[PDB]
Design an enzyme around this catalytic site. Structure first.
Site, PDB file in Angstrom:
ATOM      1  N   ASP A   1     -17.806  -8.673  -5.564  1.00 45.92           N
ATOM      2  CA  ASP A   1     -16.634  -8.486  -6.365  1.00 45.92           C
ATOM      3  C   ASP A   1     -15.788  -9.684  -6.354  1.00 45.92           C
ATOM      4  O   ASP A   1     -14.395  -9.590  -6.516  1.00 45.92           O
ATOM      5  CB  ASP A   1     -15.688  -7.059  -5.689  1.00 45.92           C
ATOM      6  CG  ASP A   1     -15.655  -7.692  -4.252  1.00 45.92           C
ATOM      7  OD1 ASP A   1     -16.255  -8.477  -3.759  1.00 45.92           O
ATOM      8  OD2 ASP A   1     -14.413  -7.015  -3.774  1.00 45.92           O
TER       9      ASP A   1
ATOM     10  N   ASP B   1     -17.469  -3.184  -1.992  1.00 48.64           N
ATOM     11  CA  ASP B   1     -16.385  -3.743  -1.152  1.00 48.64           C
ATOM     12  C   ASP B   1     -16.692  -3.625   0.246  1.00 48.64           C
ATOM     13  O   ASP B   1     -16.363  -2.486   0.675  1.00 48.64           O
ATOM     14  CB  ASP B   1     -15.049  -3.018  -1.593  1.00 48.64           C
ATOM     15  CG  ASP B   1     -13.622  -3.908  -1.212  1.00 48.64           C
ATOM     16  OD1 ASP B   1     -13.888  -5.038  -0.597  1.00 48.64           O
ATOM     17  OD2 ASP B   1     -12.687  -3.073  -1.333  1.00 48.64           O
TER      18      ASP B   1
ATOM     19  N   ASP C   1     -14.343  -8.657   3.184  1.00 49.43           N
ATOM     20  CA  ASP C   1     -13.247  -8.202   4.040  1.00 49.43           C
ATOM     21  C   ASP C   1     -13.354  -7.813   5.483  1.00 49.43           C
ATOM     22  O   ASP C   1     -14.486  -7.211   5.865  1.00 49.43           O
ATOM     23  CB  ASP C   1     -12.759  -6.752   3.195  1.00 49.43           C
ATOM     24  CG  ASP C   1     -12.206  -7.206   2.033  1.00 49.43           C
ATOM     25  OD1 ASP C   1     -11.331  -8.506   1.959  1.00 49.43           O
ATOM     26  OD2 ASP C   1     -12.067  -6.336   1.104  1.00 49.43           O
TER      27      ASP C   1
ATOM     28  N   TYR D   1       0.929  -1.192  -0.245  1.00 49.82           N
ATOM     29  CA  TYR D   1      -0.029  -0.068  -0.028  1.00 49.82           C
ATOM     30  C   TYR D   1       0.948   1.178  -0.135  1.00 49.82           C
ATOM     31  O   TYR D   1       1.807   1.181   0.797  1.00 49.82           O
ATOM     32  CB  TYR D   1      -0.968  -0.078   1.335  1.00 49.82           C
ATOM     33  CG  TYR D   1      -1.970  -0.799   1.251  1.00 49.82           C
ATOM     34  CD1 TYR D   1      -2.816  -0.849   0.462  1.00 49.82           C
ATOM     35  CD2 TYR D   1      -2.172  -1.721   2.532  1.00 49.82           C
ATOM     36  CE1 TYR D   1      -3.851  -1.759   0.192  1.00 49.82           C
ATOM     37  CE2 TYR D   1      -3.263  -2.491   2.398  1.00 49.82           C
ATOM     38  CZ  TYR D   1      -4.142  -2.718   1.340  1.00 49.82           C
ATOM     39  OH  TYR D   1      -5.468  -3.521   1.166  1.00 49.82           O
TER      40      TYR D   1
HETATM   41 MG   LIG Z   1     -13.304  -7.742  -0.804  1.00 51.73          MG
END
Ligand SMILES: [Mg+2]
Ligand SMILES: [Mg+2]
Ligand SMILES: [Mg+2]
Ligand SMILES: [Mg+2]
Lengths: 396, 392, 392, 388
Positions: free
Chosen positions: B272, B309, B277, B242
């Site tokens: 997705d 997401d 997550d 990142y």
């Molecule tokens: Mg994801």
């Protein structure tokens, strides 16, 4: 534990300047000179990859890429065969489909079956692939979770401070919604284990079910009715009058371990036998449990008291829900976080009979609290005596 | 609760008599003389007095119990009722010991009087160490072998060979098999026998750490590879990170979940094709590929390229403040700035690379835990579909 | 109103970020974002915070011109050298009179009018490596004449005999000199910081509690009010050491220094004072040594009447306790330590019955007053203490 | 500690007898007979038996104590000796009663045998209640006014006008006075009457937060401005930020310190010592907090030591478990590596090289850190002097 000490301690010259981006193929790849940017910047390749603002530029990628192609060229011919080239691709993360391999063997054009890094590079750059990873792997071990999850239900019936009082137990099979009465002594498992233990295999197991009989700060006597059907908890009433400890209040949750049995037919040491009862425990956490309440505890040690030829164990444990539970690793830790606790527990058990005209209690090991591993071996053995009590009744 | 802080009933402050347990079917009585002279209730005497009840006292309590079974008020009991009294008093009685009892009382008219019962009761004491133990139970079986999750590092970090593989070690047989952390680690961690209160909901998931607290090297569950180990995110042989700054919380994913492209959140936004997550916010850094039980608390929703997401907010059940975080609204009370920071990071992480601020659902609001758990559930269902639509 | 904010959605203003402001409010014209910002589709402020590169000279230019303009309130298109210094001042540039005359010279607005251009030109040619040369020494000058003292406790005699004594002293941490003190009269009741940094919005609740009877013990120790320097001693009767016979005290039991309940001040009708310091029950999980002193947070009080005298029993908790933070009032106790208020009250309700006494009588039917109530009782107690010293 | 865990001396298990307390000045005695008959020690019967000692038991016990005052074995006490023994056995005598008993017992030969004493004891019961209380006291009046720290934000954040101002509110008068966070907030937080265990080392410092946890905008104590409020790092009107990523711990300063190596006037580029607070709680810009010092990391800038002291807020749930630097990897695994990593590389982002550390990057322990802080505190006192 010296993982802790690694953090505090200084670091080598490998960790302070950083290293080259490595191949991952081992000593099978020749240690290289860092790319020019690292050399000019005075920052290692890996540090540039990790922290510089701009992403590595194409010429830099080519350098790293050829270092990884070369690495598969173990006999150092300066080229690779189409099949090795597919290995390389699979290693770079581009899992190609059978169609693709032939498509790539095709587009690359090995005029002799010989693919040079240059030829590879050129193919690689003209066939970028937005790797959204279109195919998903379902390969799993798929074990069967052959188990019906149960929910314990505890019901009070009758009236406390009278012979009618009873705390009963049941199991509501969750996958079926159907309720069934159970024995807290025979049915609640002794060990509390997860289907898939995710805590480090390194960390050993210590999660036991505790059945509270006498609430912290109380003195009214209650017990598992090992004589009654479904062994519900009953209050101690003799001649219509409720019984109590006269010495004073029990200052910790006092109870027993399900599926345990200390037998008056099995010896501890000559003259000392068991007391025909589940092993007792004292959980020292800060929260008072209700009568018959069941909680997951951690075993820490055990105090042994011998009375009239019978070994009467007092297991010292603590509720996993307690704020300090994670700091108590063994008996030796009780004194540091709960100073005086072990001492009060022992004194209480040493003098409690005096009040009603009895004597001081006689302990094993001169009143030493043995450590957790020892307590667990007592509990474990007890579990076995319990399994034997179950077998000898079946046939008989 | 506030029952404890509040005043007490005058029946509690002075104490009460020793009840019979046979309800209103017993005529409320006067305390026994000794409780009267003491100015202390019978119960308080039974409980706190240094002495046990005298024999005369026990008889008056025993008398009330006896008379309570005398519902008509004859002034005696048939031997069957006397037998019922003994049972009630916890004295096991079989046809054997029974007969020998009516041989002893001798109510030439079946009329066993209290004095004749008391007399006999006092002449047949028995140390009740209960000789016969009850085996009566539900005796449930458990064909299960507890599995130990084993995690192994393979290859070399920062290179294309690193992988974290997973296995199950059968604690009974000792055998070890390879498993997909994606397919085989259960999403819901459940107790075989749940002893916690039925009133208490469950909120206990397995979380797979991909990127450790305070780091920035990317790693992911290789959904594309067999047994989906964790692999490092290497592109063209160079590791990826990142660039915006370090992930300040353990960032990772939930097993047995799947958001599918082929499904809509709302018109224009699909799934997705990745497991859902999660950001676990406790104080302890987890190692790459490390698995832990987390409590779910809420979720942030991010949309990019018409794709949703989700970022589930959660906290390890081992973190010191775990018990105090009840829902998303509690995070700011104990971890002020946390949510703000987690949203800001996700809002701007693409900018240093030339991108733009992100777009969230609900104008950047953290939906609560109940909404978060549903997102996990549905995604768990999508996983099941994903799995069938293959063997088949 | 702090939780909610972090949880809730954001205004468009927040989700897109905004312009770099002059910081001079309405006095400045709202401006259009700089072009580099517009080309990026990123707010100016997001860019300065998160973009990899620093703003370039031209971008700085636009920003500094908006600033300059801001001081030009009446839009004359220029500023006086006097205002220029102000701008320099605002931009963080410390300007010694020398520099100032110099700037007035070096730009040279032969008409007093200094355009932004002339200003910008001057700024760029007199760069200054800030490093902040001159330190300001201005400060309040609070002095502390007094020396910090350390409370020291020595033990004399043999525990469980009439000679045992817990003596108190103040050690001067600068001189080393030890001087005997009275736990009762010299230990401060209120624990005060020299400079409180804790938030002002937080009412103080920190008191010193002297432990007489340690948690889980029953030996009667007490502050010897009648002896000089009031050391701790045990209750003795006819040469035999006294103990509670009812059972061990289950919490740390002690008293608050500098307090006093006199038999001469009423509380109700025919209700006087115990003629002792106010007693306290501290409920933390940790047992203190006899006479150990500790800062506690007060939570409430229970009131026992006995022979026309009020016997207050305050419930407090060691600030050192793991749950101390969560108990903000008497009502929290049943929530973190259920059974506790019940048990404490039950204990005092009956401890005398053992020795042939009767149950205790309480005030307000044994309700536990809140901490505001407890705190009023304590402050009053301090005044009776202050009066007990004056009368004497 | 482990004493609690270990077996007990057979005397402890059996129970001991009622001691004279006068020490070895009393002849060791046999348990009174009723104790022997109960097969329970005298102290166990006194602490745990339901009934009080019988009159014959009390007498036997009072006689062991009485004799213990008869150190030369005369067989009696002189009447001046009786007062003391009375107090010792637990009877509050009063000037009126002493005279009264020196008469009433009337030792017509000055000898007060135990039997005479006892006969008097039984015919005379005194309702102690203690009528006279002792007001003896050290009288350490250390009058001062409690000052409450008051913080106020001024201006607009992200612009040159944002300042954080500090103030003291005298809790007596209730009047406020602007003070300086650098010069006036105490570096060492001290109780005027420390009641915590003397054997426990003092370790409580004020921490002035400059860059809140998880943030990257820069703020700092304005060492150049009057009352040194905290301003934002603004340059050419644009706010500055750490470009490497966010600071992942509260970053601030220790008041009353000055990291300089040097006259009689002013100076320049030096600031109070740098601190990294590692608790789980984020602190607002300018917030002040008592912290526990745990260790330190040193970066050598260019022949200059740039220390970063590691510390934790006393309000943090794990404060009590971190006794020294070596404890941090145990409860906050990776925390120190990460603090080191951040400082090693934060300048690479913008074209700089990795930082170099003293001691190869070792985190010195708390002792070493409080030392660094003390030198710095002294360095601060010198600045204070030179100018004034
Ligand atoms: Mg994801
Ligand atoms: Mg037993
Ligand atoms: Mg009092
Ligand atoms: Mg420095």
């Amino acid at each position: 534990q010296d993982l802790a000490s690694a953090e505090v301690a200084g670091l080598p010259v490998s960790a302070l300047h950083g290293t080259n981006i490595s191949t991952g193929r081992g000593s099978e790849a020749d240690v290289a000179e860092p790319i020019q940017e690292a050399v000019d910047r005075k920052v290692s390749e890996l540090d540039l990859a990790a922290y510089d603002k701009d992403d590595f530029t194409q010429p830099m990628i080519k350098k790293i890429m050829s270092r990884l192609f070369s690495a598969f060229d173990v006999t150092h011919l300066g080229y690779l065969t189409p099949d090795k080239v597919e290995e390389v691709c699979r290693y770079l993360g581009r899992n190609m489909s059978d169609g693709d391999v032939k498509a790539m063997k095709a587009e690359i054009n090995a005029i002799d079956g010989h693919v040079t890094f240059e030829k590879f590079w050129a193919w690689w750059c003209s066939h970028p692939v937005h790797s959204r990873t279109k195919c998903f792997s379902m390969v799993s071990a798929d074990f069967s979770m052959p188990y019906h999850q149960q929910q314990l239900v505890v019901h009070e019936k009758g009236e406390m401070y009278t012979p009618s009082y009873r705390v009963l137990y049941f199991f509501r099979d969750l996958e079926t919604g159907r309720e069934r009465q159970v024995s807290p002594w025979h049915d609640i498992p002794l060990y509390v284990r997860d289907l898939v233990r995710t805590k480090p295999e390194a960390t050993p197991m210590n999660r036991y079910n505790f059945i509270c009989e006498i609430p912290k700060w109380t003195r009214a006597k209650f017990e598992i009715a090992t004589g009654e059907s479904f062994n519900p908890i009953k209050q101690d009433i003799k001649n219509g009058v409720p019984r109590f400890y006269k010495h004073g209040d029990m200052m910790w949750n006092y109870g027993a371990f399900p599926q345990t049995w200390e037998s008056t037919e099995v010896l501890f040491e000559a003259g000392v036998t068991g007391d025909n009862d589940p092993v007792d425990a004292v959980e020292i956490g800060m929260t008072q449990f209700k009568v018959g309440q069941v909680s997951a505890v951690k075993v820490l040690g055990v105090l042994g008291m011998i009375d009239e030829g019978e070994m009467d164990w007092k297991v010292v444990c603590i509720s996993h829900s307690d704020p300090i539970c994670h700091f108590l690793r063994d008996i030796h830790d009780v004194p540091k976080f709960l100073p005086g606790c072990l001492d009060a527990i022992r004194e209480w058990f040493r003098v409690y009979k005096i009040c009603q005209g009895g004597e001081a209690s006689h302990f094993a090991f001169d009143g030493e609290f043995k450590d957790k591993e020892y307590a667990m071996k007592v509990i474990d053995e007890s579990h076995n005596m319990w399994h034997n009590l179950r077998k000898v009744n079946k046939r008989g």
